[PDB]
Amino acid sequence: TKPFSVPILTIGEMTNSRFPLPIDMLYTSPTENIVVQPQNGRCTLEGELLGTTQLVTPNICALRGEIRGHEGSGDNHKWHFMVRSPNGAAFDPTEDVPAPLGTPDFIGDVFGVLSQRNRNTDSGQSGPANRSHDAVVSTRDSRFTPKLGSVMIATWETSDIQDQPTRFTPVGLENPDHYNQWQLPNYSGALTLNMGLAPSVFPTYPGEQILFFRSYIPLKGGYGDSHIDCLVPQEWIQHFYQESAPSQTDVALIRYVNPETGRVLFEAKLHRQGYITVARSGSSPINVPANGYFRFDSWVNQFYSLAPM
Amino acid sequence: KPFSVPILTIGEMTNSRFPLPIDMLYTSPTENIVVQPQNGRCTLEGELLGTTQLVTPNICALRGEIRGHEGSGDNHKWHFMVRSPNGAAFDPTEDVPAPLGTPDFIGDVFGVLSQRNRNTDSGQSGPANRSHDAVVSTRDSRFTPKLGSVMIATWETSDIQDQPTRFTPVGLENPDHYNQWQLPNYSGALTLNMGLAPSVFPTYPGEQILFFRSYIPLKGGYGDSHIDCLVPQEWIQHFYQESAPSQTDVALIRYVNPETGRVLFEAKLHRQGYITVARSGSSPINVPANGYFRFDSWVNQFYSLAPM
Numbered sequence: 196t197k198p199f200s201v202p203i204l205t206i207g208e209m210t211n212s213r214f215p216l217p218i219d220m221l222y223t224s225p226t227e228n229i230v231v232q233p234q235n236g237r238c239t240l241e242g243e244l245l246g247t248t249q250l251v252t253p254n255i256c257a258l259r260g261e262i263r264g265h266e267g268s269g270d271n272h273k274w275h276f277m278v279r280s281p282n283g284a285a286f287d288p289t290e291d292v293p294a295p296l297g298t299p300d301f302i303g304d305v306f307g308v309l310s311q312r313n314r315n316t317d318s319g320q321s322g323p324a325n326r327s328h329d330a331v332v333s334t335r336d337s338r339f340t341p342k343l344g345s346v347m348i349a350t351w352e353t354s355d356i357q358d359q360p361t362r363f364t365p366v367g368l369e370n371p372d373h374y375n376q377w378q379l380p381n382y383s384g385a386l387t388l389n390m391g392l393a394p395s396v397f398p399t400y401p402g403e404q405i406l407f408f409r410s411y412i413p414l415k416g417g418y419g420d421s422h423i424d425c426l427v428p429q430e431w432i433q434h435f436y437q438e439s440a441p442s443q444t445d446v447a448l449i450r451y452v453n454p455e456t457g458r459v460l461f462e463a464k465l466h467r468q469g470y471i472t473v474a475r476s477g478s479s480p481i482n483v484p485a486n487g488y489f490r491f492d493s494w495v496n497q498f499y500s501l502a503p504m
Numbered sequence: 505k506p507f508s509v510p511i512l513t514i515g516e517m518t519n520s521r522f523p524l525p526i527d528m529l530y531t532s533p534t535e536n537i538v539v540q541p542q543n544g545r546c547t548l549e550g551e552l553l554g555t556t557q558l559v560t561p562n563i564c565a566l567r568g569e570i571r572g573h574e575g576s577g578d579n580h581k582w583h584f585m586v587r588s589p590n591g592a593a594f595d596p597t598e599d600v601p602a603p604l605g606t607p608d609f610i611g612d613v614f615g616v617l618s619q620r621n622r623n624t625d626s627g628q629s630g631p632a633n634r635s636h637d638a639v640v641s642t643r644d645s646r647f648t649p650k651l652g653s654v655m656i657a658t659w660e661t662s663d664i665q666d667q668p669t670r671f672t673p674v675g676l677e678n679p680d681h682y683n684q685w686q687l688p689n690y691s692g693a694l695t696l697n698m699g700l701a702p703s704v705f706p707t708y709p710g711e712q713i714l715f716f717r718s719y720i721p722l723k724g725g726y727g728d729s730h731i732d733c734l735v736p737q738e739w740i741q742h743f744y745q746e747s748a749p750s751q752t753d754v755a756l757i758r759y760v761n762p763e764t765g766r767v768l769f770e771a772k773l774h775r776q777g778y779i780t781v782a783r784s785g786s787s788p789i790n791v792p793a794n795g796y797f798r799f800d801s802w803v804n805q806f807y808s809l810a811p812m
Contacts, residue, residue: 204558207590208559210559217589250516252737253523253560308721325725327724366618415635416635418631419629433738
């Protein structure tokens with residue numbers, strides 16, 4: 196039985212798995228009122244990718260495909276973005292996935308850059324024409340239907356968008372007005388339920404909360420200190436995916452350690468479905484050193500009593 | 505835990521010189537080029553070199569504070585006081601070329617400048633924010649990140665405050681002045697660079713460097729621009745954590761198809777963190793998308809590779 200393990204990278208050395216951002220802190224809070232069901236950054240401890248999760252960091256919340264026309268012009272140009280899988284393959288809507296891999300997994304107005312590289316070269320030119328422009332992909336729009344193969348991408352007054360191969364690089368949120376990181380988009384549009392979902396996560400043992408890896412997410416404008424939380428860092432997903440170490444029970448006991456002092460700082464449960472719980476009530480800061488990281492100790496069960504974090 | 509490389513496919517990792525998926529393997533002669541990138545540099549024992557750091561979205565990112573305009577007479581140009589990615593002040597006397605993640609090529613890097621004010625106004629629920637398209641020209645005379653500042657240019661001419669600022673890289677403004685193998689002058693004109701990761705070149709006859717190639721977006725202009733790294737970012741993160749002792753100067757690695765089990769070609773993985781193969785010219789490297797390298801054994805500079 197290959198021994199299970201987690202990376203030794205510090206949070207200052209890894210990346211958020213729900214948006215391509217550095218990780219700024221650990222964070223916990225009660226979530227009884229909330230359904231925590233993200234679809235990116237989902238992996239079992241044996242390395243099974245779930246939801247829309249894929250391995251390439253810059254493809255998290257990216258879109259790739261081509262523009263084919265538009266509906267809405269003048270003041271706000273709204274282009275028909277036919278989306279493909281990140282590997283360039285045509286997306287098959289009957290694949291057993293919620294949406295193309297990497298699709299945003301939250302309600303919001305994602306701000307980024309729409310880039311195009313034309314598929315042919317004009318006679319005598321040094322290569323194909325290119326253009327990049329600010330754009331927003333609103334995941335709450337009725338035209339956000341990635342599971343059906345298309346989303347709408349908007350460029351405001353920019354009308355210089357061609358029917359050409361197109362990539363969307365995410366940068367942040369247009370504003371915080373309609374952002375809810377825990378509400379899933381309707382991947383097939385209105386009146387059709389989502390499918391293929393990574394399961395919702397919640398603590399089952401009294402006194403426990405989920406532990407999150409938190410990143411600040413930029414805003415194009417507006418007031419707020421917006422952030423996005425993932426269940427495990429992208430590097431952990433890549434680690435489990437390669438290791439495929441057998442899960443001996445449903446719960447791995449992991450301990451956060453200071454490698455300089457050698458001191459164990461707190462303990463946590465790492466669950467088979469790929470999330471962490473800790474013994475803590477409330478939202479107060481998690482005071483840990485920058486050099487700290489988790490270390491697998493042993494396999495336990497759902498009833499293991501954690502020391503208070 | 506002897507030496508190993510990741511089993512991820514190129515379709516599963518990321519360029520170490522710009523935050524991009526990797527599109528193909530690529531090789532070509534480089535006798536008339538100096539290959540001395542400063543990002544994506546790591547020894548096989550896990551020693552990061554040059555400006556290399558571990559966070560993918562910090563590759564070619566900049567973090568710090570805007571402090572007014574750069575010089576006078578151009579309201580498009582801002583004085584960007586740069587800091588280390590972890591928030592610490594950058595010490596120009598540290599033995600590195602520049603702040604970690606600084607771009608390592610000559611070009612006009614296009615991206616987004618984002619600001620979040622350090623205070624919340626009474627009556628508002630959080631700090632004010634603004635983001636604007638921006639260019640960091642690494643050929644500018646005011647590109648002096650080793651001295652603690654760069655000039656950042658915007659199309660916006662007023663809506664930029666003296667507030668905490670981060671630059672998210674996206675691509676190149678155009679291909680006109682891009683040269684991926686020419687280093688910037690990190691301290692500006694007439695001062696040499698310091699603390700450099702060493703240049704790499706094939707010393708064995710018949711060999712070429714093997715590159716991991718990514719297409720890089722252009723804001724405008726004509727071209728199919730790309731950027732090449734020596735090893736993927738995931739390899740850097742792997743070696744950094746494993747810290748496996750290098751038994752010789754050369755690890756023999758073989759590219760394998762895990763479905764058929766068949767070994768496809770062999771390559772030298774050098775102690776300083778780059779790959780050479782026995783190939784002449786720049787014709788395509790015909791391998792399956794599921795292929796990956798596997799460590800075979802420690803050899804030496806004399807080993808004769810099978811023709812790739």
